[PDB]
Amino acid sequence: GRVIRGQRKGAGSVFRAHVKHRKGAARLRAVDFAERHGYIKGIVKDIIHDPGRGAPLAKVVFRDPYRFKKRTELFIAAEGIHTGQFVYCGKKAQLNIGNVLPVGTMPEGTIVCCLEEKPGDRGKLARASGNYATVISHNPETKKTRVKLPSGSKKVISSANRAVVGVVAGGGRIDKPILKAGRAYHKYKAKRNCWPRVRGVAMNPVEHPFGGGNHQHIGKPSTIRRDAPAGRKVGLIAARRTGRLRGT
RNA sequence: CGAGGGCGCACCACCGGCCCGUCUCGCCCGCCGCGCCGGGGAGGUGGAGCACGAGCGCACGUGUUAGGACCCGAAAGAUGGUGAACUAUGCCUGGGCAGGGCGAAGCCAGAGGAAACUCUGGUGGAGGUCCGUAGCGGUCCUGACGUGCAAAUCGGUCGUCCGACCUGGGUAUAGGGGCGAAAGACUAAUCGAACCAUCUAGUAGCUGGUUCCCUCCGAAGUUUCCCUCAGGAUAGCUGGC
RNA sequence: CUCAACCUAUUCUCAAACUUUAAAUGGGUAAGAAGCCCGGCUCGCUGGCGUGGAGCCGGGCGUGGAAUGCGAGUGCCUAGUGGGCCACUUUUGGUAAGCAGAACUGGCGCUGCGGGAUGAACCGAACGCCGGGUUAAGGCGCCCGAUGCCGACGCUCAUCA
RNA sequence: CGCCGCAGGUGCAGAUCUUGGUGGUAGUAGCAAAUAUUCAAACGAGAACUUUGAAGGCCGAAGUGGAGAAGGGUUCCAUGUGAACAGCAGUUGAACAUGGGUCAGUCGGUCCUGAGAGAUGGGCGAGCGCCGUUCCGAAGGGACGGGCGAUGGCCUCCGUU
RNA sequence: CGGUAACGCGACCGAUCCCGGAGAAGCCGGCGGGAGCCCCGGGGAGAGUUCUCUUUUCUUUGUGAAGGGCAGGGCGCCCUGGAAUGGGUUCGCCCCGAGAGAGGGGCCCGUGCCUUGGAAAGCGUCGCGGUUCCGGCGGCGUCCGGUGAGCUCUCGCUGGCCCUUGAAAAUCCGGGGGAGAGGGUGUAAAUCUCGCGCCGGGCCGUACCCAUAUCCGCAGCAGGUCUCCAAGGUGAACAGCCUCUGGCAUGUUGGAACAAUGUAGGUAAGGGAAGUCGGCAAGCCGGAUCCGUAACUUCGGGAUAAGGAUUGGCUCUAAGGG
RNA sequence: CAGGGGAAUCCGACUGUUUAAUUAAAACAAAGCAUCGCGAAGGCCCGCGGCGGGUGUUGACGCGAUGUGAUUUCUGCCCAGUGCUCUGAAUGUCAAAGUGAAGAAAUUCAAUGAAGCGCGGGUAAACGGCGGGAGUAACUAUGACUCUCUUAAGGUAGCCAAAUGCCUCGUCAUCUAAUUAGUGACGCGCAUGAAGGAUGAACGAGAUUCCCACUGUCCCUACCUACUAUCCAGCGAAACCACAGCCAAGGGAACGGGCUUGGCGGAAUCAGCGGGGAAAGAAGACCCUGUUGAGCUUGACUCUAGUCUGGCACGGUGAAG
RNA sequence: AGUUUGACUGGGGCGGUACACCUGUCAAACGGUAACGCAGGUGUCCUAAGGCGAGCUCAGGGAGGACAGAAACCUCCCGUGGAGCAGAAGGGCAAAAGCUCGCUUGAUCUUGAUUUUCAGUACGAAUACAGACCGUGAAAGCGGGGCCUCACGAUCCUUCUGACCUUUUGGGUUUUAAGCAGGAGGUGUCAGAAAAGUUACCACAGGGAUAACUGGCUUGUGGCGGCCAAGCGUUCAUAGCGACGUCGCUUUUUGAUCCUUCGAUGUCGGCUCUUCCUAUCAUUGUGAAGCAGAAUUCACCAAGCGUUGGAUUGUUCACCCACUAAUAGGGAACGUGAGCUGGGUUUAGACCGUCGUGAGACAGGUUAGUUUUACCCUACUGAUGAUGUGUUGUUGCCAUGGUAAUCCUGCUCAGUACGAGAGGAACCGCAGGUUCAGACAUUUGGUGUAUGUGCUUGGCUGAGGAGCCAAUGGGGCGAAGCU
């Protein structure tokens, strides 16, 4: 009869992201005439750590083509780029790590870092550390490009979607065992209030579908239907299968 | 006074009669509408009827009932509000944590070896490291106290004491909601649904109470029916007129 | 020749759900005037018939047709109650029960009083306030009213009467 | 107040009844956590407790020391009083009464933003309103610069509009 | 305007605009500089002891801000030059042909010293006048040294940790650029972040308590309630114990006794858990030095395993420095 | 000032947290392991409402949802059941709307056929389940071996009278003089068992057993100290109270202070004491009843937010089939 | 989200249905009559098993007859029903009510009255009529279901049937709808709601109308006895026993019941402490034996005195070790929680196994889990006192009440009596111990703040000396007193 955790998470209050010390939204520069017809050269000024994010962020400085001013962008750092390096964004940019150019101008095997989901937004795909998409194929008619995402799924996008070249820095961060509840505490204190996770079977029936009983058993199939109401779909949601995954 | 005889009130029992419904049988009658028209009879039977009215209004008593309903009494339910000064959690901005033990990586030198390399002594000062203050907590005495110093305190003994550490202030989350390293814990000494006012004199087949005198009469705990078995209706038993 | 079965005549012992016979106590009815006896009339019922039955109309009969006691009939409104319990006797279940359950009458409940030392129910008796007399059941050594009778006849000795 | 009528918020021992008062308990339990007081004097009606002096002790700088924040709000400071209060007393008091006391350019607030809160535009909403905080706004009311001019005047010439 | 340069000089024209800096950053370790405190040796002044001794013991023995100069600390600043037989160097590190060592400079901080302030004040002493209660008057003094893994602040250098990287904004400044402005050689102009001078700074708070009696707990309640300063001895020590400065009167009463029962604290012959549900409670052990340490093990631990010896006082001797 | 120590068993890896005011634990958390969903027109969630809002200043090395719980070592069989999921394969049923027919119409009938459910696959680190029955070896006993039945499989590796074993104080060994305790072992185990089983250091105010040392826990009690109690001066409550207060037996609502019969009975008091007053504290929390509730659960009955699907409207312009 | 989750009931739950009916009995000779009384039955079955008429006689047995036998068919005789009538049982029935045939649809259409249960309400069932229309039989008649006693169902709603019926709202026609009368679809909790759990996280109103603990009745069961005497006892009923039977007692067992207590009597065990009982384990005094002695057994008077130390277990019980004269059994609110303890059971946390879909449950296991108050009355313990003898004191008496001692060992008797032997006593006497009691402190031990005297750490008084502080600084020895 009590609203469960997870249900309480959408209300936001105590479960909002801790964005106090975050350095800004990491985005490609907005598409303009220079990036649409030629290239624009920027210089990497600094590479900084963004709290709550495993990937480094590259502070990149460009020139405003229309007024005397310097523009500062907050790119996602592809692995290999360094300070004092020139990066080039645009259609006519070359195939180097850190450059930004449309997928349609790229060969059929190049991998990319901060890929646009739609032609004109900033980067949306393959942004977490160590991840990369791959350009699979092109359709010059209908101006489409098939790419492979870090999850292994194929996706058809516009050929004008921009991306950085290379993998995103931050390497195999998940290789190291955390080893310590304290290190997990510090890891999630920079992200959001989610970490110490109480099992549902350890709760009472009032705050969880799995709670209650004289033994800590679920008492019902942990797989739950997709159309289950909020407060009920806990466990394995719409699971096509369960078990050990021997075979693929 | 009077055997007998007569008219017989009210009322009672019975037999007839009449009115409406409805059955059965049956032959007639009426006409500015001749009809799928209208009326009539006899014999049963249903009616809270008729058969030379008794009602209406007012007052009083008793009984039943709807209402706060003889008086006091729930656990609850609903509407609208007030609280995070305690606590729970997130965030912001500050403050704080003796003295010792162990001795991680890195580094120096020496020694042994044919080499590969090994050994030895230092240096270094890591760690949700150890002993142990302040702090924080609260194991046992099932100690004290138990109309207390105290609506949870005190004594000794204890757990931890560089970290998932302790803490001030500022902020955010509000009741079927929050928050929870999860005990149904905590949410102003209140929590298996806070507090405040109202609906509300909530309902109670259940418990308690129910205020002057004398006189007369005087019970029942049984029948039948009831989601009936701590209650009713019903008949009985009672009193009054 | 023996042991069975079977039959016949006998013999022992029984029945809430067996019975020929069959009480006591018990239940119904009658013990008159709304009756009895004469004539007559009605009927669509019944019918050999003036039949049968019923109804109706007149008339005559009082020794008022057992005992005992008592004044009856009738209507309206109606409260409380709807936990009962006990005793003699009958009686079911149970080893039994101050158990559980029935029948009959009385009682307690609702009830005091005399007696049972004491006691809801046993025995006597039911109650206005008193005086005198007399009893009931029960008693009469002393408590404690009354045997302080020259009471009658026996029985009985208990170191748990 | 009696009598004849009328009308009731009309009669109390109870309700762990309501409010008020009062007993026994009972001059009882008790005034026992943190080592501790003593001598003399003064004032005074009055001294275990006030003041001064002397002595003996304690806190032992993580204090029983010296200063602040929050909170309190005059408790601060003199003088006086001895009603009540300070669970014994009091000549003392954070009590009572009468007076007095807080002085800033440079100590803070004030200013800034933080987590956050919150109007407007817009959207929703029966509605009080609430959602939202850059989102769906014609969101710059400013500027030494230059020009057009009014010469407003110590109209030379620079400030003004 | 000066210096090869780092950069310096008292100013050192300049808008819109652009760039940058400061504000503006975590925790921990180890070193070094400075101060305050503590300590040691003398010299003064005043007190204490003097039964005997003690040239003794105690107290006290200043220089604010803001300027100027000089130490001291720091520099990832410059010039010369070119290093292996590598060298320099730290407690640790670490540094170098991308320029070591060495020599010579530059800058920053300068809370330390001297100086203006400044001795006139303050303090300590010794006296003399009174203005019932004079910022009175007067004398004398306010001196010289030494130490340090000491404590506390502070400044700096260099490390470690993080799947943790430890605010923002007001506000102030520097630079780039050069639109413009100012005068015709005048005792000159625009202009000036240089020296001095003139005027002003409103509003609110400000007492006191800050707790075993000024707050909350119904109270003068053994509870709760955020901080700063922090002496001597012992000692590893902000431990415990004693003391100085400062504070207090035993925690809302006293007196007299010293029964039981209690609450708190001790001891106990011989035995040693036989008590009890159960070694509950109490007791044992304990610091430091020197030895010596098992099974097992995730090889890190176990480990202060277990077990044994020693420990005072006094008088010396060696060794460790500048 | 200032650790008693040793040998083991169980549980939890550790450090951490927890029921303020009876439970600090073996419970929660944890790293590690595993599974599930999701490529943004999305997953999960909030919201009365707005293309509103949180994750999200995010983007699969990420968010969200679960289980188990360090390391090591394994993690067996079963998809019948219930869930979940996947493609519809001629396909069964299946509402409104729409279509057709009859009728004068209301209306009736028929055709058509969305999701869902059925049918068919997958899935157990989803929930869960892992029994029987016969036959069978040259002493007997067992059954390596062969067939079956419900039906989906028959309990594998391990472990055990375990915190899980009724019988049970199981049997054997060991520890003791003596052991319902402990440890080791056995195992047809009422009713062990594999994301949890079994191990294994370190750790623990966790549960247990033994040994050394130590002692007033005890034999078996004594003495001492401080504060009380005690007496005094001052001050001064509360709980509770039908009336009260000596017993034995009787009878009685079956355990009397009162009544009956007996024993008997002497003012006012002080310090103690805990046998009685079925002492006080609280309208029993156990138990039942009530056509009194509330917290929670679920194919209980009846609904509902949200979601999936069809239809009508916004809703338009051209082509092909 | 809202609600529900029956009742009865020797507590409730589980189980049953005694919840609507029928038969026999209970039931006490009218009728009625209860319990979770006894023995049973019912929710159907039947176009005939209904209705008439006719004709037959059944069960069983005996005697016969080819196969044919203990049972196949046929015949005769006996046959009061001993068969059958659908079913449970009871009643009833013979040219019946049974069996076989023939014809049939009275199992139809109607109005009332009545009986049964009963309130004299309904339903159901039934009886006697009356009016139709029929069946059968020659007819009298008989028949409106079953030989009789059971076999079943309101309001509202639905459905069907009937009247050339009534209404359908200003009139008319036609659909439709509504009525009136009679059937049917059903309520089995059967006078008739529409209905799953859990709560140890729990709540409230109550109940001693009702369970769990004491007490009371009872005594099956437990325990302890007796009577008879078949047998056991080499023989021998009764030294000691006691089969088949039978009579009792007890309330330390467990049941049975539900009288008291639910505005609360604190619920196991242990520890502590007192008293009581005797159904006597030991000890005193005795009697009997299958009593030679020693040992043992039975019984009497008898409860004065005693009945212990431990391992395991929460245990009460149990079992073992060991000592002993003996290690008897019991009661007192299953004595004793303002006496304690809290191990157990019996709240809330948690783990396992089993059960359940789940929440949750488990006289299953395991771990952690607040034990409050006396100052009142009495009782008891001690302490003052009080009434009376004029005041007061000394010395006394004893009414009454209490009461206390206990058991063992060794020496001697005595290697004696007795006995074949092995063994093996007793009385008197002597020396000592146990348990208990009442004292006491000369001695030993304990205490020790004489704060007595040395030693000693840290600090403090300038040092010495003398001291002090550290809640008794520590430690050695220690008088007195207490013990």
Ligand SMILES: [Mg+2]
């Ligand atoms: Mg978890």
Ligand SMILES: [Mg+2]
């Ligand atoms: Mg839980």
Ligand SMILES: [Mg+2]
């Ligand atoms: Mg739920």
Ligand SMILES: [Mg+2]
């Ligand atoms: Mg569960």
Ligand SMILES: [Mg+2]
């Ligand atoms: Mg008439």
Ligand SMILES: [Mg+2]
């Ligand atoms: Mg009436």
Ligand SMILES: [Mg+2]
């Ligand atoms: Mg009322």
Ligand SMILES: [Mg+2]
């Ligand atoms: Mg409701």
Ligand SMILES: [Mg+2]
């Ligand atoms: Mg707060």
Ligand SMILES: [Mg+2]
């Ligand atoms: Mg640590």
Ligand SMILES: [Mg+2]
């Ligand atoms: Mg530690």
Ligand SMILES: [Mg+2]
């Ligand atoms: Mg306690």
Ligand SMILES: [Mg+2]
């Ligand atoms: Mg729970």
Ligand SMILES: [Mg+2]
């Ligand atoms: Mg009310």
Ligand SMILES: [Mg+2]
């Ligand atoms: Mg009903």
Ligand SMILES: [Mg+2]
């Ligand atoms: Mg009642």
